[PDB]
Design a protein around this nucleic acid. Sequence first.
RNA 1: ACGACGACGUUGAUAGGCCGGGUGUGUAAGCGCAGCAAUGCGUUGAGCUAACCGGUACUAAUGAACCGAGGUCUUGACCA
RNA 2: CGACACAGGUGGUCAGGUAGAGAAUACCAGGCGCUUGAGAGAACUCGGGUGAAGGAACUAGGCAAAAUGGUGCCGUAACU
Lengths: 29, 114, 114, 106
Amino acid sequence: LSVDKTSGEKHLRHHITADGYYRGRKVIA
Amino acid sequence: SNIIKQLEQEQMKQDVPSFRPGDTVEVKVWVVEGSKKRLQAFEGVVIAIRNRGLHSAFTVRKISNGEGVERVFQTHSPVVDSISVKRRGAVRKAKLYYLRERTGKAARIKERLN
Amino acid sequence: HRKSGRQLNRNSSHRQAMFRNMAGSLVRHEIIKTTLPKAKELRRVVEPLITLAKTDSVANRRLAFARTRDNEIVAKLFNELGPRFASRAGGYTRILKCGFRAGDNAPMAYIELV
Amino acid sequence: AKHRHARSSAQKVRLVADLIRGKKVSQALDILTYTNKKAAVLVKKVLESAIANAEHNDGADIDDLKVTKIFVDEGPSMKRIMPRAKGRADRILKRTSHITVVVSDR
RNA sequence: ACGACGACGUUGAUAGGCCGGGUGUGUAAGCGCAGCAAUGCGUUGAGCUAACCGGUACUAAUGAACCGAGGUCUUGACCA
RNA sequence: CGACACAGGUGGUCAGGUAGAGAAUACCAGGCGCUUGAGAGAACUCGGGUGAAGGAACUAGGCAAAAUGGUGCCGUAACU
């Protein structure tokens, strides 16, 4: 359950409902 | 105007560019240059198509006059040595702005004809 | 070299091609996934395509089924997704790039239609 | 963890096992992430999985478990038709690897 | 060419979209009357298109990690 | 068959499938994608398509390239 910038919900597959990420930068809420 | 055509209305100012040049149109140009003893009067010369010229500093075109050995050359209009022009034939058609031919093929039914 | 023109990732043919298709994908399904040069140029395959196809008529619907070979998502572009973008100029269907996926390392967003 | 199967080369399957031979397991994870050599992965799946099974089973603390011994020597060989040149036939005496990893409490 | 170099990173116009400016071609869709037809006409000296520029941030330039010696000595004047 | 899943070699039948001057190009039927990949608009060849003016001046030799080069009418020399 480790998130890059923020912290909380995570999954080594899809983005996250908080700001979205993986390594990119885009994706907003 | 923009910084490209804002500094071009001075030299060779856009003096009411005579309707024609236009296709087959052959407006007898003018002149006032010296080259020799500065006392040269008017002059005359037949033209044709092969139009040319842009926005700011536009030029006449390929005179293509039959008289004499042949033709060529031309002074951009307007110019330090410019003056009003007149009319001629009543237009025609083909494609004015670029029209070769007429050269290397100038005869009766050939010239003054597309 | 010279200025920045188009981008032929492969050759000439492989480069109209490709644009079509993966263009009708953003009208059949509001979700597409290519690469980096991805649909950045497909953002063009769509609008052009929208507009000149905005208002329903004869001199528009044809331009539609000319770039996109399909009857299913050529009529839906009308009566749907317009009139649905009425008082809205531009911003047709943009998208924010997404992190690269497995296999061939290449970041890709998801076109989508807003 | 340990090491079995593969199709490595043994020769190039080391030097990476190097630098990560000393103590400190953390000093074995920070490094090896950037090796720029094919001999980075596979050898990382281990030593990282070696610390595993070390926590659960064979009780040990990750805070004091370090790398003690790691060697690379084994095969076996195998015939391999690897068409080279402009057109010929040659058997490849290719050899596999052996990446040993022991991350116990030092 | 790899590397480098240079600008910017919201105190943003860097790039794209849109509009406009500056350009390339050349007479549109449709319809009327055209015409047997090819396509000749009138409506349009009308459309279509662009690897320029400007305006405009509307869209896209985050977060966060990290390389990291630690003021090395023997010894001239001035200052305190 | 040729050491190998080597663009080499190897007999017969289908030469009326559709458009032309034909068993030539494009295209149904049928078959196939089994002749390693990804990113950047160098210098640096082999293949390839021709240049404003002159034009073989290159060269052992115009080698190479190009040019004339369908059909119908008119007309057609020396020599035999």
